[PDB]
Amino acid sequence: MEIKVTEIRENKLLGRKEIYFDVLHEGEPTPSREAVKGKLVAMLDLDPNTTVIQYIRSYFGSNVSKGYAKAYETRERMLYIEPEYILVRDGLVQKQ
Asked: Signal peptide position in this chain?
């Protein structure tokens, strides 16, 4: 239920911030990716609608998971770079 941002890098060329973070999640084997996204978006003042969580990797016996996210400058920039299957997977685009 805690997030610690470990690195924020600005990718000028693709128009996104590249964000690594820890998730502290006592009592869980793994944390809830939607809950993690909400915390991360709040912590860094991101746009939920342009934030792609690439992975949240948990480790057995550890309270600590390791995540990586991409926060796009605009939705357009996200639409240009991210494959459709990923945006649909993570709820950012709604499949017709």
From this structure: none
